[PDB]
């Protein structure tokens, strides 16, 4: 009587909603009527999108790049002719895809030292312990302290078009924003200060395998030191045995003509990344995109199924309890 309250006598306001067959029956019907169309939609949408890939690894003397596979003269070259049966007007995207490259690995991701990357003062001085193998080389601090940076994807590619004139016709590309705005402008920046680029690193050597330093990669300084977009995208662990990385990109011109037309194209590469040592492939994939993305009919058929399934379920659920 004196200390009684609702919380102490289980008599609080109970919303108490209770379900049954007749209450969820529509839910199944409605979700089917909504899912089936949405799924078939994303299916055709992500379907129409046209993509194409080519493996320039060799592994077949039949392919011209095979004779350029094993250790050959340092600057190896090879061409891989390919045809484009269809022309895609949508502003294209260029990715370099690889296989059997275990990006996701404790030792491979733990070597990334966000300090030197972000551009910290005390960082440049000493690299952390997590980057146990590539801390220094011959007792000199490395700026890109990490096995990921050491294992950069440097083999560059060049794509040309062929028209009625059998000789080549290169295609223009833009290096801006190959990485997201955040992981390039705020996530990482240059050391404490500097108007020029070399002064920022005084006694700082470079990664072992990397021959030329990072301060000598791109002409414009907004894409050279620890902010080079190519290297930054590679510094993103995809987490899959096989994965794709965006190299460059060919956006459409402010005009209405079609970006890439139908015809034979020329592909020449610079083979400077060995992979046959572990039976891994190397390739490049070009494609268009949409609000969904490149070819991936998974979500489409998934919605088709989930919808139709729930719908048929309601069908039975209804035609059975209706017998009352």
């Amino acid at each position: 009587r004196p200390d009684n309250t609702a919380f102490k006598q289980q008599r609080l306001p109970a919303w108490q909603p209770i379900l049954t067959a007749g209450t969820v029956l529509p839910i199944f019907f409605i979700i089917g009527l909504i899912f089936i169309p949405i799924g078939i939609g994303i299916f055709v949408t992500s379907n129409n999108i046209r993509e194409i890939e080519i493996d320039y690894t060799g592994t077949e003397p039949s392919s011209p790049c095979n004779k350029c596979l094993s250790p050959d003269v340092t600057p190896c070259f090879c061409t891989i002719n390919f045809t484009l049966e269809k022309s895609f007007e949508g502003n294209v995207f260029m990715y370099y895809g690889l296989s059997n490259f275990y990006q996701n690995h404790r030792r491979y991701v733990k070597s990334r030292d966000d300090s030197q990357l972000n551009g910290d003062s005390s960082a440049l001085l000493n690299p952390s312990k997590e980057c146990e193998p590539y801390r220094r080389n011959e007792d000199k601090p490395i700026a890109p302290c990490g096995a990921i940076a050491n294992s950069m994807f440097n083999d560059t590619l060049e794509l040309f078009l062929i028209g009625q004139d059998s000789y080549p016709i290169p295609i223009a590309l833009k290096k801006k924003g190959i990485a997201w705005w955040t992981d390039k402008n705020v996530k990482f920046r240059n050391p404490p200060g500097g108007d020029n680029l070399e002064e920022r690193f005084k006694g700082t050597t470079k990664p072992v395998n990397w021959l030329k330093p990072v301060y000598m990669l791109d002409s414009d300084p907004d894409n050279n030191g620890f902010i080079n977009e190519d290297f930054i995208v590679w510094m993103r662990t995809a987490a899959l045995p096989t994965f794709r990385k965006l190299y460059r990109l060919i956006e459409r011109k402010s005009d209405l003509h079609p970006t890439l037309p139908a015809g034979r194209y020329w592909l020449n590469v610079t083979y400077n990344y060995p992979v046959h040592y572990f039976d891994g492939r190397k390739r490049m994939i070009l494609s268009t995109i949409s609000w969904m993305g490149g070819k991936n009919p998974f979500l489409g058929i998934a919605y088709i199924a989930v919808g139709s399934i729930s719908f048929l379920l309601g069908v039975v659920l209804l035609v059975i309890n209706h017998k009352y």
Binding site: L12, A21, H105, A238, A239, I289, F298
Partner: protein, 1064 residues
């Protein structure tokens, strides 16, 4: 053997204290810790912590110790509170105000310090603080009156006397009284006998029994009445009851579900073991030969630590288990204790059952058996103290079935207000005269001579003191009518018919109440005439006389009276001749004054003297209950519970109130195992099967069968069970190792089981614990609940799976010893029928859920190793793994446990048939276990596979970018939390306004925290793996449409279930 020093008082003896606590002030940790490690989770994480001290391991010792100590201490506090509560409740009664004056201090002392050999003053209406020796009573004849309704549970009063008188007034003023001393022996626990000498050639003997026994020795809780102050010595005997209760000294922490917790952890530990074995082995074999150093991305210092052939194997085995050890959950104990404790107050601060008297409605003793309360199967109850009190009253006598009773009512309000001048005698002043006269006579009452102010109570004190209250209430009924029965000590029961008329009579001879005959009579001489013969007798002991004029009228009413649970007492008389009376007189004194085997001669003669009589009706008397019998017993019978009564009150009144509670149906062919005790010592051996093997199967196959789920309708139930006495029980229990033809205890339980109910009369507390353990072993293991009033059945409170006590019914001391206290037998229905069963649904859903979350959380973490180079690279963020998981998981589920009734308390209280039978223990049997794990698989596999399927493009963003490793893992983490939370939300039924807020609030906590972390706190801290990654993920509308499908497919089977579980 006690010296009992003469000039001195005492030394070298065990004083009296209160021992009802579990742990001790000094060695509590060595007790609580071992009792706490019976929970495997703690054991597994402690062995893991211990192992993490051999060589350098990636996991730090602090993150290995913190999971243990944060859990160990919580239970330690919620175990301490309990023991300290019992300690305070014990100290209060330990330091009780006690009157005592022997050595020097004239003032009164405390019961905490009372050495042996000390005179103790026990005022009127005082509870004996200990057991004493009495040979000095203040009042004349050194006679007092004491009742033992808590020690042995006797309804009949205790008679005793002493030799000296008020020697205490001289003990304080002088030392002359301290001349004598007492010698004792090795104290025996039962307390039946204690012998010695007291400084003179005199054998001071004593012995207890289940009936009225000891006079000299006193006992604890022996309520004192009809006296001023008494003085006794030798306090050490108080330890006798302590030694009688100590049987339950240390058997505390258990549960019906916590056993299943460890059994659950078994297969769960095997799950871990299996995953660790597969991961480690399938790594060594699959990539160990050529991929160890080939990838060239990394090169371990000193070639994989000089490639130790097997040390690497073990270092990685641990690296896998410690990462997989979330399967085995330890944070489920802190939350389970929070439920166990914060759910305790639900019964404490409750008005649903609060005695209007300052007496407390309930008390909470332990926070360890709440969940198993509403999960009982067998119940052991008591008669006096719980079902009734040590008294009895009479109502509606039947003189030829003519006397009835009425009350005030709407239509019949005129005749009840004022008595008419004609209705005062229709069937009363015709025979009621002799009826009430015989009532006032033939009774060994011997009432008090002095009295207090006549008018303090309804009429006067009117205290008639006899040996048993069987007839003490009959005189009170005579008082209700016109008769009074005043004095009678030196006169023949002077009484008053209706008005203030003395009605004196002379008592010539009085007959005894023997057990072979079972009748009580008296021979008196009236003042206005000749001699008469009054008598009452038993049922079939007095009906022997022909009584042609009036048989059916009284016989059927006696039948219905005994059936309803009354103690039918017939009444008759006869006219004796003046000369034949002398013939009987002489032949009776010839046997009385004969000193050669009078027990046989006297019995034969005074048994044949009564050869006929005149039946004058009957009188029914009932031993009133404490609560309505049908709701308490009918509800348990319908709920399934097996009800048994093991008590310490006389068999006659035992059978009486048991038959009154309707547990003994009208047509119950009862069985007894007490009348064949003195005769045929080895017949019981070949009698058990002849009465149970032969009869049960006979009536079971004569008529159709009787199922286990539903019963109590067919003629099979006709054959009720039995009632045993403490003798036959201890005779068929310890000495059943002689004959090997057929087992005896086995068949004893075989009959005690398949029946309506059973009664165990003449049973000691230890003797009742044997029955508790008797049922605690057959057919696996059922659950036992016991409840009693005083220290007689308190030795069952802990032996039974759960202890329920009533305070003040007889002895309160028994409640603080119990696990729960409820001074209301009526409200025990609410306790186990609602508050406990709710705890079961609550924590059962809680455990299935906790395992569900920690498995749906880690299964993707395991399958991910298939794509990770089995380098145990967590897909989940480092802190995100533990931090948000425990910051979310614990809140809504604890809300479910604390405040949630899958079905409300009143709708379940109104119907137990559809409440307890459906529950059982199936909440966490292999039925729902394998079903829930399927849900663990389906969601853990769909999370992973679905996300990995959508990742086949590298173009999710509306513009098209790469997707970091932690993005994928934080995608599955997301669908995971949304799925588990919404899952619980769909599984809940009680949507209180404070639970609805925490569920949605925790999901909010998720979005809010993950977003805050994603955007500001990156450069100020030590290091961060993902910066604006959570948002970068949420930027692709693709993932929206994908994750929603993932959670939907995850909960689709649950939705289906809900539909099924609620329809049909």
């Amino acid at each position: 053997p006690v010296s009992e020093t003469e000039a001195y008082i005492a030394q070298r003896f065990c004083d009296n204290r209160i021992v009802s606590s579990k742990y001790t002030l000094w060695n509590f940790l060595p007790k609580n810790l071992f009792e706490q490690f019976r929970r495997i989770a703690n054991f597994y994480f402690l062995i893991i912590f211990l192992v993490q001290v051999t060589v350098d391991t990636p996991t730090s010792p602090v993150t290995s110790g913190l999971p243990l100590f944060f859990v160990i201490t919580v239970t330690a506090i919620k175990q301490g509170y309990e023991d300290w509560l019992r300690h305070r409740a014990d100290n209060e009664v330990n330091k009780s105000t006690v009157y005592i004056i022997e050595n020097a201090k004239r003032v009164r002392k405390e019961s905490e310090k009372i050495k042996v050999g000390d005179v103790v003053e026990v005022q009127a209406d005082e509870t004996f603080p200990c057991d004493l020796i009495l040979l000095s009573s203040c009042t004349t004849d050194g006679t007092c009156y004491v009742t033992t309704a808590s020690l042995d549970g006797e309804s009949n009063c205790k008679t005793h006397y002493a030799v000296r008188d008020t020697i205490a007034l001289c003990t304080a003023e002088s030392i002359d009284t301290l001349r004598a001393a007492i010698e004792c022996e090795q104290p025996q626990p039962d307390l039946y006998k204690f012998v010695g000498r007291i400084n003179i050639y005199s054998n001071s003997l004593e012995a207890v029994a289940r009936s009225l026994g000891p006079e000299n020795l006193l006992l604890k809780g022996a309520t004192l009445k009809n006296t001023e102050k008494i003085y006794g010595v030798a306090v050490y005997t108080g330890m006798e009851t302590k030694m009688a209760l100590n049987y339950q000294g240390k058997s505390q922490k258990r549960s019906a579900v916590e056993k299943s917790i460890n059994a659950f952890l078994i297969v769960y530990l095997f799950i871990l073991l299996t995953k660790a074995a597969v991961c480690t082995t399938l790594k060594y074999v699959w990539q160990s030969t050529p991929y160890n150093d080939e990838p060239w991305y990394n090169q371990k210092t000193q070639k994989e630590r000089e490639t130790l052939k097997v040390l690497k194997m073990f270092t990685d085995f641990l690296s896998f288990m410690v990462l997989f050890n979330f399967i085995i959950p330890v944070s489920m104990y802190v939350t389970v204790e929070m439920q166990k404790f914060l759910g305790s107050f639900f019964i404490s601060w409750d008005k649903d059952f609060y005695d209007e008297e300052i007496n407390e409605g309930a008390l909470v003793n332990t926070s360890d058996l709440n969940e198993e309360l509403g999960q009982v199967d067998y119940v052991f109850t008591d008669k006096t103290g719980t079902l009734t009190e040590n008294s009895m009253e009479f109502i509606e006598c039947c003189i030829d079935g003519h006397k009835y009773k009425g009350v005030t009512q709407e239509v019949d309000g005129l005749s009840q207000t004022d008595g008419t001048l004609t209705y005062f005698d229709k069937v009363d002043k015709n025979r009621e005269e002799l009826f009430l006269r015989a009532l006032c006579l033939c009774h060994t009452v011997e009432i008090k001579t002095n009295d207090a102010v006549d008018g303090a109570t309804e009429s006067a004190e009117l205290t008639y003191i006899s040996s048993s209250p069987d007839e003490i209430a009959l005189v009170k009924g005579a008082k209700r009518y016109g008769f009074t029965f005043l004095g009678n000590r030196n006169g023949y029961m002077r009484v008053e018919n209706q008005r203030k008329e003395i009605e004196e009579y002379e008592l010539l001879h009085t007959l005894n109440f023997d057990a072979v005959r079972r009748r009580m009579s008296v021979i008196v001489k009236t003042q206005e005439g000749d001699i008469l013969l009054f008598c009452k007798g038993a049922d079939s002991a007095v009906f022997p006389r022909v009584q042609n004029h009036e048989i059916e009228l009284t016989k059927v009413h006696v039948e219905r009276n005994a059936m309803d649970g009354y103690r039918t007492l017939c009444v008759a008389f006869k006219e004796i001749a003046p000369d034949d009376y002398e013939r009987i007189n002489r032949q009776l004194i010839e046997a009385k004054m004969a000193l050669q085997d009078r027990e046989e001669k006297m019995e034969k003669v005074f048994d044949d003297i009564e050869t006929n009589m005149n039946l004058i009706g009957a009188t029914a008397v009932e031993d009133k209950l404490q609560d309505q019998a049908a709701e308490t017993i009918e509800a348990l019978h319908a709920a399934g519970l097996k009800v048994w009564v093991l008590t310490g009150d006389k068999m006659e009144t035992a059978k009486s109130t048991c038959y009154a509670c309707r547990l003994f149906q009208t047509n119950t062919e009862l069985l007894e195992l007490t009348t064949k005790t003195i005769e045929e010592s080895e017949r019981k051996e070949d009698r058990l099967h002849e009465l149970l093997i032969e009869y049960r199967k006979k009536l079971l196959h004569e008529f159709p069968k009787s199922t286990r789920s539903f019963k109590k309708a067919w003629t099979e139930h006709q054959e009720y069970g039995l009632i045993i006495d403490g003798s036959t029980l201890s005779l068929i229990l310890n000495s059943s190792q002689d004959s090997s033809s057929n087992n005896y205890k086995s068949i004893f339980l075989q009959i005690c089981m398949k029946c309506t109910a059973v009664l165990c009369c003449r049973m000691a507390p230890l003797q009742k614990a044997q029955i508790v353990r008797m049922v605690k072993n057959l057919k696996g293991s059922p659950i036992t609940l016991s409840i009693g009033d005083g220290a007689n059945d308190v030795s069952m409170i802990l032996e039974s799976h759960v202890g329920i006590g009533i305070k003040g019914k007889e002895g309160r001391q028994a409640a603080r010893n119990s696990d729960y206290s409820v001074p209301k037998f009526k409200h025990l229905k609410k306790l186990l029928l609602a508050h406990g069963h709710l705890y079961y649904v609550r924590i059962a859903h809680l455990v299935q859920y906790f395992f569900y979350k920690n498995l749906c959380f880690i299964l993707p973490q395991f399958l991910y190793q298939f794509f990770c180079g089995f380098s145990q690279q967590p897909l989940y963020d480092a802190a995100y793994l533990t931090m948000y998981n425990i910051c979310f998981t614990s809140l809504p589920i604890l809300a479910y446990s604390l405040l949630e009734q899958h079905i409300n308390i009143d709708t379940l209280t109104s119907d137990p048939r559809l409440y307890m039978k459906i529950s059982g223990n199936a909440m966490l049997q292999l039925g729902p276990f394998l079903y829930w794990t399927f849900l663990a698989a389906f969601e853990g596999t769909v999370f992973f596979f679905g996300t990995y399927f959508l990742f086949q493009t590298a173009s999710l963003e509306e513009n098209g970018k790469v997707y970091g490793n932690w993005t994928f893992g934080t995608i599955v983490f997301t669908v995971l939390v949304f799925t588990v939370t919404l899952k619980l939300a769909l599984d809940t039924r009680f949507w209180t306004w404070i639970n609805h807020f925490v569920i949605w609030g925790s999901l909010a906590f998720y979005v809010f925290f993950s977003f805050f972390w994603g955007g500001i706190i990156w450069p100020f801290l030590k290091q961060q793996r993902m910066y604006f990654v959570f948002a970068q993920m949420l930027s692709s509308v693709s993932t929206w449409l994908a994750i929603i499908l993932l959670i939907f497919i995850s909960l689709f089977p649950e939705i289906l279930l809900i539909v099924l579980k609620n329809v049909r």
